[PDB]
Amino acid sequence: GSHMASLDMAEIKEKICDYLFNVSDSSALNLAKNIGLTKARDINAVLIDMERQGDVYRQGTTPPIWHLTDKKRERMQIK
């Protein structure tokens, strides 16, 4: 919920990266449905931390839809 340095949170973060990059942009609710419903609070915590760092952004309110940022995609893809 805070333990961003744990193996467990690194695994949730890569599952989020994998989904947002290879599947699509997503609500947090849909990420939990795909990654594991019992991990919703850690998914929310990782998204908030990635947002603070400019690696994802949220779009809209009901619910917000999470997207990879251009800064993050530039580390992953060619222009």
The Cα 42–Cα 47 span in angstroms is 9
**Choices 2-10, 17-25, 28-36, 41-49; region in contact with Cl ion by CB under 5 A:** 17-25
Contact between 65 and Cl ion (CB under 5 A)?
Answer: no
Residue 33 as a binder of Ni ion (CB under 5 A): the answer is no
CA distance 16 to 42: 11
Closer Cβ to Cl ion, 32 or 68, answer by number: 68
What residue has token string 């917000």? 64
Binding site for Ni ion (CB under 5 A): 1-3
